[PDB]
């Protein structure tokens, strides 16, 4: 449970176009996301990788 | 380079989406409002001809 | 930076939206008093038949 976790700046509220979903990535899998979370759609915001927090 | 490339093809999708969120209604309504003012048109002709 | 500039730009066409609909709100009304002012083509046709009368 995120109860906890939650911060309002690392979402982008007010729902026009556009959302922030909560992504988990392995810890081994860190470079080869970083490269293509840009392409792993169309049309994503290509700078908002931002570590929330690690186990 | 290639993040600047993608935030002004968000400028694009804004650009395409307000040819179609702001235009598409000027393009029925008018055209509804037009059959209207033809119907006000044609509900009067009726009656100002029948005091004549 | 990235997300602040993205709201910005979306209030230009949320603008565009009260852009479509001054279109409506201006073109609704203004063309329904012309529709009022065909009234004179009954104030004309009236006191021309009136000399049909006459």
């Known amino acids: 449970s995120l109860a906890e976790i939650v911060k309002k700046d690392d979402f982008v509220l007010d729902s026009e176009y556009l959302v922030t979903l909560l992504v988990v990535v392995p810890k081994l899998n860190h470079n080869d996301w970083i490269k293509q979370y840009e392409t792993l759609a169309e049309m994503v915001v290509p700078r908002s990788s931002n570590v929330l927090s690690e186990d | ?52 | 930076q990235g997300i602040q500039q993205l709201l910005q730009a979306e209030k230009r066409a949320a603008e565009k939206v009260a852009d479509a609909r001054k279109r409506k709100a201006r073109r609704l009304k203004q063309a329904k008093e012309e529709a009022q002012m065909e009234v004179d083509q009954y104030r004309r046709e009236r006191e021309q038949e009136f000399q049909s009368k006459q």
Do not use: C, P, S, W
Request: a negative charge; aromatic letters at 8%.
């Open chain 2, 1 to 52: 380079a290639d993040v600047q490339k993608q935030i002004k093809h968000m400028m694009a999708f804004i650009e395409q989406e307000a040819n179609e969120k702001a235009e598409e209604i000027d393009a029925k309504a008018e055209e509804e409002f037009n059959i209207e003012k033809g119907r006000l048109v044609q509900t009067q002709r009726l009656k100002i001809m029948e005091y004549y």
